[PDB]
Design an enzyme around this catalytic site. Structure first.
Site, PDB file in Angstrom:
ATOM      1  N   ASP D  39      43.927  40.913  45.257  1.00 57.47           N
ATOM      2  CA  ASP D  39      44.115  40.040  46.414  1.00 57.47           C
ATOM      3  C   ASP D  39      43.302  38.760  46.270  1.00 57.47           C
ATOM      4  OD1 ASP D  39      42.134  42.489  47.772  1.00 57.47           O
ATOM      5  OD2 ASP D  39      41.403  40.427  47.707  1.00 57.47           O
ATOM      6  N   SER D  40      43.372  37.887  47.268  1.00 60.23           N
ATOM      7  CA  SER D  40      42.786  36.564  47.146  1.00 60.23           C
ATOM      8  C   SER D  40      41.264  36.618  47.119  1.00 60.23           C
ATOM      9  CB  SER D  40      43.254  35.654  48.280  1.00 60.23           C
ATOM     10  OG  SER D  40      42.893  36.191  49.519  1.00 60.23           O
TER      11      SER D  40
END
Ligand code: CDL
Ligand code: 3PE
Ligand code: 3PE
Ligand code: LMT
Ligand code: LMT
Ligand code: LMT
Ligand code: LMT
Ligand code: MYR
Lengths: 126, 171, 56, 84, 67, 103, 121, 459, 155, 79
Positions: D39-40
């Protein structure tokens, strides 16, 4: 402890409450700002990248700035209670202030010399 | 111009770098880096965006209180000790056009290849201008983005000052 | 006195010579830093003589 | 004196020491989100590890775009004037 | 060069730098010990400091109260 | 939040050109085409001669025959004289100090 | 320090004033007080070119040391004995100043004591 | 002085009878020869001045100003010949003729024995100067600058004419040697107050005194380079030279009449120095720097002491070369980018290394680094004003700080930092430009080895 | 540059404001002139009183050192806000608190130095004694006037 | 051109990074970058002196030379 901005210390952008409350009307304005910037960027880059150009890319913003900071002042100057009081306060006032400082100092010095109470024992350069 | 996601991810990177400045020691920094990552993870799946914004705002106030007054800066980052250090050595390529013929004579091979690049720039320029015209809406560009070249043999519009920029360590 | 005063001035004049040589008279740009460093080291020797005379 | 292969080796070396990436399913073209399933927040940590690895900062606007090892290698080679 | 960089490892060291560094570190401690042996007064005190309370009234010329 | 395909294509094309430009900065083998202990003492011997001996000759000549020929240009602090000294100029003997009280 | 606490916090009247002392006659309580002898003459100190602050009652030891230093050049480790003799003389000089302070302090304490005795009738 | 007046006149037939392509070569060569012979005026005596005839005399004040004047003419021809290249031949010769006629008036002005003769030549210099600015200036505002220059001068100089004629009626002479012996004290009265003002205001306007200085930044921003050089180097000094002479016959009234003008100068120099920190036009900044330096000269002249008169003379010579250098340096940038805006072209040390050295040397003299004659002159004035009143050192000291700030600010902004990306016509410095810079700084720094020749009669 | 592209007088009507905003390459919603007093700003925009140091250093400015873009309106006081001069960046400590702590520190120290002069430290010794009438002749004393004797005694 | 040491050798076991992992597991957390730091606690970097150990660099031989020097001086004076 809240941030207190001052003239010489701006409010951080992350603590600005207007930074988060962003409306569609505020996004529209940001888009229009980026369009002006992009339009000017393109106009600049077309000259900056032109292989046949040699010289200066005249910037009207720079010309407007130097013109405003000189030639454009007096035409837009109005004698009124503000500029006259600022004109007097910082134009004549310092001259009168320094006149009395130096005049008082020199009268005191001259009175002592005439009475022979100023020590000039080795003073022969002036 | 920053989305909510971009704002959160910028604070995470910024908060970790100030945390690293406080901790100093790698094992200590690793320990508190995981604790900080957990705090971001608890509110990862927040859906009420009003609550998410309030969490972001409160976090920024927390960062401001707890930031390092003298955080670490990479030497060549803005504000670093080597930032702009080598700008005095960067000379634009157009300066070689004013070299005396005897100066150019010392590098016959370099200047022959330089003329090829100048020829490439000259023959590419008209097509670059035309591509930008036919791809730009009526009211001018709305963003600073530039396009690639579309055909073969074309060069991306406005490439010269990017391709021929001074080296980062030019001397 | 003649050695003391002569050597104290030669220290200062010694330091100015690499500056005068920037007029491309008899210059060896290959190793100007070595030339300047050598002048300093020789000036240190000459300055120790009057310093020794003062201590005596 | 960095080389293109030297940059690639170190970029992959760092990623192989990250517990959230399987070292056998990692290639220079693996997409951090669409392939490795990160994920980011994970991506931000990867960029920070590269900054420490090579000793320079990658600004947030450029960092958020680097989504595979090759893009990081290309980004670093560009900043450092690496052409071989 | 004759020193090649290493990756994630302790660097290569020459014998000259190690031996020279130790010799001057040893020189520092010999000098301190040698100086402290002969010039310990420079650190602790050169002369005794007297107690003024132990000076008799006779040697200070203090007459008796009724004088 | 990665590159768009158009951003990726442009970066790839500029990257090809930039690397070609950087390679073209390498000098060819012939460039620059240029237009047409015994030693150690000698190096230090010529330096001492030209930067110490010649300057000191000039300074000594200048001091001896121009500066010291004018009043008060070089003024020495007069030498200290101690009890028991003998003077060269006159031969005078400076008497010793009294006998010290024992201490 | 100690004396400073007594003067500034305690009773300043029984403590010497370093800027005014002595306040009692030199011979007060000192039958036949001798004069301080001086070995070096004014001319000797003038010729030796001693700093004025060095032209004190220990100058003869300083002059002896200075001569040894010039004569022992380049051996800068010599003259230790002569240097110690000058240092030691200065120590005795300093102790005499400590005695003057202590004498002045006790005389002030006696003066106060007599005044209590006088006004307690 | 005929040995200088006649060869100066002969420069005009030389220029008009030269081959078309040799007007610059011939006029430059022979005006350098005239400059060489001007060193014969150094025959100065300890007691008497060099009194040539009934019309002309030279002393230790006029001699350094004469040598500066004759040196500047070849420098002005060097500086002008490039921007005048397109001009047609006849108008090129008319330009050179105006420069020559300016020198002729100046050398007569500085050696005129009689004050009314000094007046006429002092006024004559306006005509060619006005023609140079209005005819060969570049911008629309040269016409206004010509008018302000013309009428500021005449507003003050016409009262001077009445005062001078009045003095001759009362005393019988205006010969300066005669006035040295027949001078009588000026008594207090309202008539004498206005006689004093008439005798001084014309010179104040030229210096220029703070409050009467607004014509000078105008004149510089509009003048061609040669106009700026002669304006800054010599024409300002007509006021100082005039004041140094006429103050002879104004004692003791100057004791109290000088007070308002000392206050204007003392406070004026700090204001103008502060103004330099915010100027956006490079020529305008140098112009305001002149007002600040010349405020020191006014103070020095008005307090009338041997040290102040020696400092005033040195300052006038030192500023003449420094300010002329700075205008020439700024012009050499203008000939490339065609703008006077200081912030337009930055980081020029990267592109013009040797020109940046001239920039450094000029800036260092402008801030009066010791032992330059710029510092000697300033220091002598500071020493003498301290005796006049100890409090002046605070104002003098503050100005020294501000002077360093704006001098180095000008150096930093234009030469250091990053170069401007789009300015790609910064061609290498020409031999002419480098020679022009060195012909300013080299005599300036050489004068440090023998300062007495620029210290004036009081030396 | 034509005269229609140069600064003009303070704008009165809304149409003038729109014209001025366009001439300065601004949104009319952003354009705002300086207040119409006698100062002489004309229609020049009033922009935020912020240093150039506060601008984003990673953006690709046309003028990186100044952090300006070609064609963008320049702050009236741009020359005072270059990175070499006045900074207005946010500070980790509030401005008013910084002034309190700095002044408080200096004021406290000055008070203590005055206290320390009124109660100096010194050793418990008498005055240093010198021979020959306190070195009367050595200190430049007049050799024709006999000095008032200074006698020192043993202790 | 440059041989990176085999990445598998970098383990946190025996290092203070292992202590941190144990502390984090008490809270249910895990440090995924631990092996990227392991090289700082291994090999030639494993044992650094303490501050007192640093100040005493060269003391042993300085003392050995000092003892020999004074013993010699005692001898020469004794004769
Ligand atoms: C008889 C009549 C005699 C005629 C006159 C003879 C003297 C003129 C010499 C002409 C020959 C000049 C020459 O060929 O040398 C080339 C010389 C070296 O060649 P280069 O390395 O290629 O120069 C390139 C850069 O311009 C070089 O730039 P740079 O930055 O490397 O160095 C230039 C230097 C400028 O050069 C200097 O001024 C030397 C430093 C001062 C000494 O600038 C400074 O360093 C400024 C320092 C100023 C502060 C020093 C402290 C003040 C103390 C004052 C002491 C007073 C005495 C007590 O270049 C120059 O210096 C050009 C300027 C020459 C005139 C300078 C004024 C000298 C007088
Ligand atoms: C514009 C319109 C206004 C026009 C100017 C107005 C006239 C101002 C006159 C000032 C007074 C001068 C005067 O009249 O003095 C007359 C008097 C002559 O008398 P006399 O017998 O010769 O000598 C004994 C003195 N009673 O004594 C004298 O003659 C002494 C006067 C000497 C000559 C004075 C020259 C003119 C003075 C006025 C200008 C001064 C200010 C200049 C300011 C310029 C600023 C740029
Ligand atoms: C007596 C009379 C003295 C008169 C003094 C006049 C002083 C003039 C005022 C300065 C004018 C400013 C000129 C422009 C220079 C400038 O803007 O520089 C800004 C510079 C910023 O530097 P910095 O903070 O380090 O930031 C670098 C990273 N961006 O910041 C600077 O470098 C300028 C900082 C200096 C500010 C002046 C401080 C004066 C201090 C005086 C107090 C001390 C009094 C005497 C000593 C006490 C007694 C022992
Ligand atoms: C006037 C007298 C002045 C004082 C003169 C004193 C001279 C003393 C010279 C001693 C020379 C010692 O030289 C140096 O000693 C250290 C001792 O730790 C050695 O170091 C030794 O221990 C370290 C670890 O502790 C290891 O690298 C290895 O076991 C060994 O090298 C160096 O390998 C050796 O190069
Ligand atoms: C009795 C009273 C009259 C006294 C007259 C005394 C002087 C008489 C001079 C007569 C000759 C004049 O000469 C005439 O003018 C000039 C200068 O020579 C020449 O033309 C000139 O053109 C240019 C300058 O403009 C130059 O190349 C050069 O100076 C010359 O060729 C003419 O070609 C010539 O015909
Ligand atoms: C105190 C001693 C010296 C005093 C000298 C004063 C005398 C007058 C000097 C200036 C004379 C110039 O004469 C005239 O002045 C005005 C402004 O003043 C100029 O006009 C200029 O300013 C005015 C007023 O802001 C503008 O309307 C005009 O657009 C502008 O060109 C004229 O174009 C010029 O022809
Ligand atoms: C050997 C060292 C010698 C020098 C020692 C000098 C120390 C003297 C420090 C004096 C200055 C203290 O100044 C004082 O600080 C406190 C704490 O911030 C401030 O207190 C205030 O600020 C804080 C923080 O915002 C808040 O809790 C609240 O606003 C208020 O309490 C006071 O408003 C200020 O007047
Ligand atoms: C005794 O010999 C004197 C030793 C010096 C003690 C100094 C004490 C300093 C304490 C703070 C000073 C406060 C101002 C009065």
């Amino acid at each position: 402890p809240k941030y207190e901005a001052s003239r010489l210390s701006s409010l951080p952008t992350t603590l600005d409450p207007a930074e988060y409350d962003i409306s569609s009307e505020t996004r529209k304005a940001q888009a229009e700002r980026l369009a002006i910037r992009s339009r000017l960027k393109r106009e600049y880059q077309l000259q900056y990248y032109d292989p046949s150009r040699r010289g200066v890319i005249e910037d009207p913003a720079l010309v407007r700035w130097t013109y405003a900071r000189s030639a454009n002042i007096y035409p837009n100057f109005r004698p009124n209670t503000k500029t006259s009081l600022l004109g007097a306060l910082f134009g004549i006032g310092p001259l009168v202030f320094w006149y009395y400082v130096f005049k008082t100092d020199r009268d005191r010095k001259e009175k002592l010399i005439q009475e022979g109470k100023l020590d000039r024992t080795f003073n022969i350069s002036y | 111009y920053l989305t909510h996601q971009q704002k959160v991810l910028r604070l995470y990177k910024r908060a970790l770098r100030h945390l690293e400045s406080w901790c100093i020691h790698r094992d200590k920094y690793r320990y508190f880096a995981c604790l900080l990552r957990a705090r971001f993870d608890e509110h990862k799946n927040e859906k009420d965006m009003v609550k998410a914004t309030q969490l972001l705002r409160e976090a920024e106030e927390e960062f401001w209180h707890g930031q390092h007054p003298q955080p670490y800066i990479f030497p060549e980052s803005p504000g670093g000790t080597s930032y702009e250090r080598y700008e005095c050595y960067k000379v634009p390529e157009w300066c070689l056009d004013d070299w005396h013929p005897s100066e150019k004579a010392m590098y016959p091979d370099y200047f022959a290849k330089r003329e090829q690049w100048k020829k490439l720039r000259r023959e590419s320029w008209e097509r670059e201008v035309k591509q930008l015209q036919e791809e730009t809406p009526v009211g001018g560009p709305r963003t600073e983005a530039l396009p690639p070249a579309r055909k073969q043999g074309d060069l991306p519009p406005l490439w010269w000052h990017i391709v021929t920029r001074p080296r980062e360590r030019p001397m | 006195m003649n050695m003391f005063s002569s050597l104290s001035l030669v220290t200062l004049l010694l330091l100015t010579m690499p500056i005068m040589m920037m007029s491309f008279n008899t210059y060896k740009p290959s190793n100007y830093p070595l030339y300047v460093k050598t002048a300093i080291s020789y000036a240190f020797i000459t300055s120790m003589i009057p310093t020794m005379m003062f201590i005596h | 004196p960095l080389t293109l292969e030297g940059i690639k080796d170190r970029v992959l070396y760092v990623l192989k020491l990250y517990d959230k990436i399987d070292p056998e399913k990692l290639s220079v073209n693996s997409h951090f989100m669409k392939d490795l399933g990160l994920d980011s927040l994970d991506q931000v940590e990867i960029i920070m590890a590269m900054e420490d690895e090579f000793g320079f900062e990658i600004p947030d606007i450029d960092a958020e775009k680097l989504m595979c090892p090759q893009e990081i290698v290309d980004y670093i080679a560009d900043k450092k004037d690496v052409y071989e | 060069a004759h020193i090649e960089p290493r990756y994630r490892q302790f660097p290569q060291l020459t014998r000259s730098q190690v031996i020279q560094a130790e010799f001057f570190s040893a020189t520092m401690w010999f000098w301190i010990l040698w100086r402290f042996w002969h010039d310990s007064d420079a650190v602790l005190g050169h002369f005794p400091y007297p107690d003024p309370s132990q000076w008799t009234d006779e040697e200070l010329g203090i007459p008796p109260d009724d004088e | 939040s990665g590159y768009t395909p158009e951003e990726k294509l442009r970066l790839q094309q500029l990257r090809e050109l930039r690397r070609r430009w950087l390679k073209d900065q390498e000098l060819s083998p012939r460039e620059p085409v240029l237009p047409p202990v015994i030693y150690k003492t000698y190096r230090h011997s010529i330096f001492a001669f030209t930067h110490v001996l010649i300057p000191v000759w000039i300074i000594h000549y200048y001091l001896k025959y121009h500066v010291t020929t004018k009043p008060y240009t070089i003024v020495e602090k007069k030498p200290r004289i101690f009890p028991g000294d003998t003077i060269l100029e006159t031969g005078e003997v400076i008497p010793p100090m009294k006998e010290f009280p024992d201490q | 320090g100690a004396h400073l606490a007594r003067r500034y916090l305690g009773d300043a009247s029984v403590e010497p004033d370093p800027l005014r002392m002595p306040t009692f006659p030199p011979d007060y309580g000192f039958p036949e007080r001798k004069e301080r002898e001086m070995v070096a003459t004014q001319q000797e100190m003038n010729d030796a070119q001693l700093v004025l602050q060095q032209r004190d009652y220990c100058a003869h030891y300083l002059i002896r040391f200075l001569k040894c230093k010039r004569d022992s050049f380049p051996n800068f480790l010599a003259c230790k004995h002569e240097r110690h003799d000058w240092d030691y003389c200065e120590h005795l000089d300093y102790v005499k100043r400590m005695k003057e302070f202590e004498r002045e302090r006790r005389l002030l304490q006696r003066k106060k004591r007599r005044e209590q005795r006088e006004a307690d009738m | 002085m005929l040995k200088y007046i006649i060869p100066t006149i002969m420069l005009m037939p030389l220029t008009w009878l030269s081959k078309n392509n040799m007007i610059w070569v011939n006029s430059t060569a022979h005006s350098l020869l005239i400059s060489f012979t001007s060193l014969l005026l150094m025959n100065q005596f300890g007691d008497n001045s060099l009194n040539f005839s009934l019309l002309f005399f030279s002393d230790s004040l006029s001699t350094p100003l004469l040598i500066l004047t004759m040196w500047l003419l070849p420098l002005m021809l060097m500086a002008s010949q490039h921007h005048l290249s397109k001009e047609n031949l006849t108008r090129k010769k008319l330009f050179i003729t105006m420069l020559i006629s300016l020198q002729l008036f100046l050398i007569m002005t500085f050696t005129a024995m009689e004050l009314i003769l000094f007046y006429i030549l002092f006024e004559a210099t306006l005509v060619p100067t006005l023609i140079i600015i209005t005819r060969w200036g570049n911008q629309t505002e040269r016409l206004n600058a010509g008018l302000y220059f013309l009428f500021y001068t005449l507003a003050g100089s016409l009262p001077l004419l009445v005062a001078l004629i009045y003095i001759q009626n009362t005393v019988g002479s205006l010969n300066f040697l005669m006035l040295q012996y027949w001078v009588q004290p000026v008594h207090n009265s309202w008539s004498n107050v206005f006689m004093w003002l008439a005798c001084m205001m014309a010179f104040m306007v030229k210096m220029p005194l703070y409050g009467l200085h607004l014509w000078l930044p105008k004149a510089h921003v509009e003048a061609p380079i040669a106009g700026s050089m002669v304006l800054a180097a010599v024409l300002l000094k007509l006021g100082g030279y005039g004041m140094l002479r006429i103050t002879l016959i104004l004692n003791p009234m100057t004791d109290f009449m000088a007070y308002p003008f000392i206050m204007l100068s003392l406070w004026g120099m700090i204001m103008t120095s502060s103004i330099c920190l915010r100027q956006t036009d490079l020529k305008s900044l140098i112009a305001y720097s002149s007002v600040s330096h010349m405020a020191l000269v006014i103070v020095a002249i008005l307090i009338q002491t041997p040290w102040s008169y020696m400092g005033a003379t040195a300052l006038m010579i030192a500023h003449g070369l420094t300010s002329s250098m700075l205008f020439c340096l700024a012009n050499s940038n203008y000939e490339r980018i065609h703008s006077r805006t200081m912030i337009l072209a930055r980081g020029l040390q990267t592109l013009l290394p040797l020109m940046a050295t001239w920039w450094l040397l000029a800036s260092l003299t402008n801030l009066a680094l010791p032992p330059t004659i710029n510092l000697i002159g300033e220091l002598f004035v500071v020493m003498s004003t301290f005796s006049w009143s100890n409090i002046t050192i605070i104002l003098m000291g503050v100005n020294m700080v501000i002077t360093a700030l704006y001098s180095l600010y000008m150096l930093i902004m234009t030469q250091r930092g990053k170069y401007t990306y789009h300015i790609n016509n910064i061609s290498p410095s020409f031999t002419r430009e480098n020679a022009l810079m060195s012909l300013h700084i080299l005599p300036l720094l050489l004068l440090t080895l023998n300062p007495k020749i620029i210290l004036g009669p009081l030396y | 540059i034509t005269k229609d592209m140069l600064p003009g007088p303070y704008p009165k009507t809304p149409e003038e404001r729109a014209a001025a905003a366009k001439k300065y390459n601004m949104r009319v919603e952003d354009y705002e002139p300086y207040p119409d007093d006698g100062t002489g700003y004309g229609d020049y925009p009033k922009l935020p009183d912020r240093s150039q140091q506060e601008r984003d250093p990673w953006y690709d400015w046309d003028h990186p050192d100044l952090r300006l873009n070609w064609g963008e309106p320049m702050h009236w006081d741009l020359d005072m806000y270059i990175r070499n001069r006045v900074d207005t960046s946010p500070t980790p400590v509030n401005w008013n608190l910084m002034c309190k702590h700095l002044f408080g520190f200096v004021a406290f120290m000055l008070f203590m130095f005055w206290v320390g002069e009124t109660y100096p430290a010194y050793q418990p010794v008498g005055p240093k004694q010198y021979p020959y009438n306190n070195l009367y002749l050595e200190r430049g004393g007049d050799p024709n006037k006999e000095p008032e004797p200074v006698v020192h005694y043993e202790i | 051109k440059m041989e990176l040491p085999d990445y598998k050798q970098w383990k946190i076991e025996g290092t203070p990074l292992e202590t941190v992992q144990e502390k984090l597991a008490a809270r249910g957390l895990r440090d995924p970058w631990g092996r990227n730091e392991a090289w700082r606690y291994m090999g030639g970097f494993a044992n650094n002196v303490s501050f007192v150990g640093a100040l005493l660099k060269g003391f042993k031989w300085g003392f050995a030379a000092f003892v020999v020097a004074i013993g010699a001086e005692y001898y020469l004076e004794s004769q």
